């Protein structure tokens, strides 16, 4: 579980969004596993604006932050789950690292700020949904 809080926006995994989220929906892309909802209070996270391929992510299933190298955001085939059938997920970055389903929402961060959230994994890989192209999150 987990979210990004930037300005009056809340970014979550689409597959974990709540009632208030859909109600206050700003934007969602099923192919990216992303949903942005409006917030009352102002958030304090900074979104990275960069092409970094190294960073640190939070793994709730280890209570540990791991340094990782990750691929640039791309179209990647993701095995069927309880949330989606087998499909190409867009804007997805892979690293070698441990993850389990319930780690989704864990932040990936570089020196420039928030890069993305845990979205996919299995076979010793962890996938992260990029948010760095979502320029409107900053205004």
Ligand X SMILES: Cn1nc(C(=O)NC2CC2)c2cc(F)ccc21
Residues with a catalytic annotation lie at 15, 33, 104
DSSP state of 71: P
- State which residue, 7 or 36, has the beta carbon closest to ligand X: 36
Which DSSP helix (H) or strand (E) runs through 22?
helix 19-23
List the single partner that 12 binds among ligand X, Zn ion, none, CB under 5 to 8 Å by kind: none
Taking the C-alpha atoms of residue 31 and residue 126, their distance in angstroms, rounded to an integer, is 17
Beta-bridge partners for 54: 69
**Interstrand relation of 107-110 and 54-59 (parallel, antiparallel or unpaired):** antiparallel
Rule CB under 5 A: is residue 6 a binding residue for Zn ion?
Answer: no
CB 81 within 8 A of CB 132: no
User: Per-residue contact track with ligand X, 27 to 46, x per CB under 6 A?
Assistant: ------x-------------
Rule CB under 6 A: is residue 87 a binding residue for ligand X?
Answer: no
The residue of the chain with the least Cβ separation from ligand X equals: 121
Rule CB under 6 A: is residue 21 a binding residue for ligand X?
Answer: no
Q: How many residues bind ligand X (CB under 6 A)?
A: 17
Would you say 110 is a known binding-site residue?
Answer: yes
Taking the C-alpha atoms of residue 138 and residue 51, their distance in angstroms, rounded to an integer, is 17
* Residues within window 39-78 making contact with Zn ion, judged by CB under 5 A: 48, 50, 52
Closest by CA to 53, choosing from 117, 115, 133, 107, is: 115
List the single partner that 118 binds among Zn ion, ligand X, none, CB under 5 to 8 Å by kind: ligand X
Q: Which residues bind ligand X (CB under 6 A)?
A: 15, 33, 78, 81, 83-84, 99-101, 103-104, 118-122, 126
């Amino acid at each position: 579980s987990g979210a990004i809080y930037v300005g009056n926006y809340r970014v979550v995994n689409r597959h974990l969004a709540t009632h208030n989220d859909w109600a206050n929906l700003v934007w969602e892309d099923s192919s990216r596993d992303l949903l942005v909802s409006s917030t009352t209070a102002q958030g304090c996270d900074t979104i990275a604006r960069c092409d970094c391929q190294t960073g640190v992510y939070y793994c709730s299933s280890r209570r540990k932050h791991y340094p990782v190298s990750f691929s640039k955001p791309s179209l990647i085939f993701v095995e069927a789950s309880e949330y989606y059938p087998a499909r190409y997920q867009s804007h997805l970055m892979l690293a070698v690292g441990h993850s389990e389903p319930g780690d989704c929402g864990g932040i990936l961060r570089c020196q420039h700020g928030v890069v993305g959230i845990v979205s996919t994994g299995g076979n010793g890989l962890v996938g992260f949904a990029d948010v760095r192209d979502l320029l409107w999150l900053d205004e």
